[PDB]
Design a protein around this ligand. Structure first.
Ligand SMILES: Nc1ncnc2c1ncn2[C@@H]1O[C@H](CSCC[C@H](N)C(=O)O)[C@@H](O)[C@H]1O
Ligand SMILES: Cn1ncnc2c(=O)n(C)c(=O)nc1-2
Length: 244
């Protein structure tokens, strides 16, 4: 038996997704990158309780498979599929160490790569994703912006309190907590843009593109003036699409 970090977070992550200001921007940006899923087979990596895979199934995907390292999160994911009677299937795997489970039209990986604890493990994850993709498929990912700096402002008001920033091999490691009750602590890794693009190339993707989060006028209208300045000038998050 082996502990995963989210085994102690569990239901609090869903609490975070319902209150954090940044979540609506993440969801909007991710589905903008995904586009139409009708008929597609989908692999949702670091699936948590299964949000993205389940919404992708709700938008008309064919087969949807979810993978997460946390037995606790997979247990919550399976209970949601049981409650809504949907066909999602889930597996407990460490993505840096797993075998491919099939060839998919779409791999969705929201908040996977920032949990690679070395550039070596980053590279392994991308290789695994490439081995899971049909030749005309694509990877849609959401991860930490390599250029985020804690000196330029915390993200706590958007839902993620970043507690510190430490050099960690060629990148950085951050301790943090989701703004929940009580707050739920976790750690994540900020690898450089160069290491990401090298991991993508060496895994056999010919195309990648970074995607700035889709913050919109209606988001700005409904918060006090300047609320989104740190989000715009020191963004913690970024989108990423890769194609074989
Ligand atoms: N190496 C790894 N392999 C697979 N899952 C991992 C992982 N490291 C962390 N995770 C999982 O990644 C998740 C981050 S939470 C993100 C959940 C979901 N994608 C959403 O946005 O709704 C946690 O469930 C955690 O257990
Ligand atoms: C899982 N998850 N969900 C939302 N937001 C984040 C996030 O900002 N960071 C930095 C992170 O490591 N993990 C997140």
């Amino acid at each position: 038996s082996t502990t995963a970090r989210y085994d102690s977070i569990g239901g609090l992550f869903e609490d975070f997704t319902q209150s954090a200001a940044q979540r609506a921007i993440e969801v909007r940006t991710i589905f903008h990158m995904i586009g139409d899923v009708s008929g597609k087979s989908v692999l949702d990596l670091a699936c948590g309780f299964g949000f993205f895979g389940r919404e992708i199934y709700r938008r008309g995907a064919a087969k949807v498979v979810g993978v997460d390292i946390s037995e606790k999160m997979i247990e919550l994911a399976r209970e949601e599929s049981r409650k809504y009677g949907d066909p999602l299937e889930f597996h407990v795997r460490d993505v840096a160490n797993m075998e491919p489970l099939g060839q998919f039209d779409l791999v969705n990986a929201a908040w996977l790569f920032n949990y690679a604890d070395s550039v070596e493990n980053l590279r392994k994850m991308f290789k695994v994703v490439r081995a899971s993709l049909k030749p005309d498929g694509k990877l849609v990912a959401y991860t930490v912006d390599p250029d985020f700096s804690l000196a330029k402002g915390n993200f706590a008001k958007y839902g993620v309190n970043v507690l510190n920033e430490r050099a960690w091999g060629p990148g950085y490691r951050h301790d943090a907590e989701f703004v929940t009750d009580p707050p739920s602590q976790f750690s994540f890794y900020r690898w450089s843009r160069a290491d990401y693009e090298s991991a993508i190339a060496d895994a056999g993707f010919s195309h990648f593109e970074w995607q700035k989060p889709l913050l919109e006028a209606d988001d700005i209208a409904t918060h006090p003036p300047g609320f989104w300045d740190v989000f715009q000038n020191n963004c913690l998050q970024t989108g990423l699409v890769c194609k074989p």
